[PDB]
Design a protein around this ligand. Structure first.
Ligand SMILES: NC(=O)c1ccc[n+]([C@@H]2O[C@H](COP(=O)([O-])OP(=O)(O)OC[C@H]3O[C@@H](n4cnc5c(N)ncnc54)[C@H](OP(=O)(O)O)[C@@H]3O)[C@@H](O)[C@H]2O)c1
Ligand SMILES: O=C(O)c1cnn(-c2ccc(F)cc2)c1OCCCc1c[nH]c2ccccc12
Ligand SMILES: [Co+2]
Length: 159
């Protein structure tokens, strides 16, 4: 099983300038729970976004996808193809926008956090993948985060 996991604004934005224009501390803990013990696939730009003490994220097999044959990720494995990284009974692609789409053929789970932030779409932003009509969503209750933004959890599922 390959899953995708991301947070997004009501508009689809997941990242700008190589980072995230929000931080919900509740979102970060559902990320760790959902991924703890499994494999995480990220692109080099997203690994590049993790600070040097936080990487590799703990308790997990950190796989970085990259076209540089000689790029290094201390504590992580660097694979040149997405499907090379798919070796565990549970794989979680943790972004960003380029890998969400590339991993989207392989995925049966989409855990999406929708952040009610008015963030207009802008050039160079990374986007959540467009989920086609084969995906079936469960919708949670609207919640309040301590960062002041409200959020909600979508659980898309498909055979
Ligand atoms: N939940 C969230 O809101 C969330 C989650 C994660 C990340 N983010 C945001 O996502 C944004 C970054 O996403 P991104 O779309 O800019 O870059 P990315 O998807 O993070 O990684 C892009 C890199 O992956 C490699 N790559 C791309 N296509 C490939 C392919 N077909 N085969 C092999 N390797 C390939 C290349 O590395 P080389 O150039 O080294 O080849 C490319 O530069 C950041 O802003 C981050 O904050 C947000
Ligand atoms: O998982 C961990 O063990 C962990 C602990 N601290 N941090 C961390 C949080 C913020 C930050 F700026 C640096 C490190 C972690 O990374 C996970 C954070 C959840 C997250 C939201 N969007 C993401 C995009 C890519 C990758 C992880 C995320
Ligand atoms: Co688990």
């Amino acid at each position: 099983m390959v899953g995708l996991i991301w947070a997004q604004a009501t508009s689809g934005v997941i990242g700008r300038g190589g980072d995230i224009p929000w931080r919900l501390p509740e979102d970060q803990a559902h990320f760790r729970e959902i991924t703890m013990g499994h494999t995480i696939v990220m692109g080099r730009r997203t690994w590049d976004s993790l600070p040097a003490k936080v990487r590799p994220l703990p308790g997990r097999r950190n796989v970085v996808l990259s076209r540089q044959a000689d790029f290094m990720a201390s504590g992580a494995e660097v694979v040149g193809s997405l499907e090379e990284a798919l070796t565990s009974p549970e794989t979680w692609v943790i972004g960003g926008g380029q890998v969400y789409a590339l991993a989207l053929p392989y995925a049966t789970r989409c855990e999406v956090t929708e952040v009610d932030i008015g963030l207009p779409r802008e050039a160079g932003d990374a986007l959540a993948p467009v989920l086609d009509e084969t995906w079936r969503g469960e919708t949670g209750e609207w919640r309040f985060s301590r960062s002041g933004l409200r959020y909600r959890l979508y659980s898309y599922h498909r055979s």
